[PDB]
Amino acid sequence: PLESQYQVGPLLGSGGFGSVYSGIRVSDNLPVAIKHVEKDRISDWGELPNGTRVPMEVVLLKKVSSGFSGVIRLLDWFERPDSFVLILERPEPVQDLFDFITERGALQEELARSFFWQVLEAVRHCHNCGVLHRDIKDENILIDLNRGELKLIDFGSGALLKDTVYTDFDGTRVYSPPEWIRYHRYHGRSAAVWSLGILLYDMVCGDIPFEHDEEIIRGQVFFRQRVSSECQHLIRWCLALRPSDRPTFEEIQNHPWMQDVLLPQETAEIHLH
Numbered sequence: 613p614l615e616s617q618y619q620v621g622p623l624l625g626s627g628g629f630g631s632v633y634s635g636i637r638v639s640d641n642l643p644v645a646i647k648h649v650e651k652d653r654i655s656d657w658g659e660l661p662n663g664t665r666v667p668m669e670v671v672l673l674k675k676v677s678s679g680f681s682g683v684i685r686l687l688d689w690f691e692r693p694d695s696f697v698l699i700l701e702r703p704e705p706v707q708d709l710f711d712f713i714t715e716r717g718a719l720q721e722e723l724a725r726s727f728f729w730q731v732l733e734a735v736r737h738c739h740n741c742g743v744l745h746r747d748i749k750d751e752n753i754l755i756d757l758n759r760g761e762l763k764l765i766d767f768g769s770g771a772l773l774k775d776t777v778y779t780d781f782d783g784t785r786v787y788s789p790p791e792w793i794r795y796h797r798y799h800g801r802s803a804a805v806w807s808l809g810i811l812l813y814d815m816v817c818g819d820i821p822f823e824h825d826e827e828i829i830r831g832q833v834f835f836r837q838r839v840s841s842e843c844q845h846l847i848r849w850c851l852a853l854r855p856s857d858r859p860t861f862e863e864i865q866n867h868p869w870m871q872d873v874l875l876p877q878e879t880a881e882i883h884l885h
């Protein structure tokens with residue numbers, strides 16, 4: 613009985629993902645986020661080990677929600693006649709990376725390094741768990757402003773990770789790779805790496821590098837803010853036009869720009885408090 617266990621608060625947001633509310637679990641006052649998704653708007657379905665028809669999003673969240681992480685944790689879910697309701701952990705205080713960048717503009721490289729590193733660790737965790745997010749971008753990253761810890765949120769466009777080609781995509785187009793634009797084909801890891809290149813550029817420049825399809829497939833990167841050569845190099849590497857010319861996660865994290873990352877707590881003390 614959903615209505616009983618949780619006390620619902622203000623609507624946090626709504627859009628392609630559904631409607632998400634602030635809430636608190638009655639039993640122990642735990643902060644929570646309560647996400648409603650209408651059934652008729654769910655295209656991708658899956659099955660629990662148990663073998664129950666649920667949204668893929670729930671399957672993926674269960675796969676990654678084991679242990680601690682830079683990934684939002686699913687605490688519970690409920691089915692209703694016309695919708696599924698998901699109960700997720702809610703950090704407090706929090707701000708999404710899109711709003712944070714709106715407010716503060718292009719981020720100092722030290723801060724972008726710390727943030728980008730944590731995104732990489734979260735994405736690796738998803739991939740280790742057999743999950744491909746497919747919509748990595750600033751709007752899908754929450755900052756725990758007190759702990760300086762980032763977390764990945766909306767798995768609504770995700771899929772099981774596989775080594776064969778994907779021919780479907782319903783993530784964010786301006787973060788989608790040229791091979792998707794030209795051929796409607798991509799492989800998971802290398803498409804993720806492209807979206808990570810877009811994200812890093814977004815962090816250090818305060819906006820995404822490409823708006824239009826033709827810019828995406830041309831793949832020419834213009835830097836509108838002062839950005840160090842090492843950071844430009846990593847970004848251009850992530851945005852290589854040929855999928856196989858993109859770095860692996862290991863190569864990103866071994867990149868010279870990625871060395872000597874701040875810890876999350878230092879990150880909050882220096883840049884968020």
Ligand SMILES: COc1c(O)cc2oc(-c3ccc(O)cc3)cc(=O)c2c1O
Binds near residue numbers: 629645707708765766
């Ligand atoms: C996994 O799917 C989602 C999603 O699609 C949107 C979300 O939004 C929030 C949130 C919290 C505070 C804000 O100020 C704004 C958003 C928390 C979530 O946990 C959350 C979520 O798990």
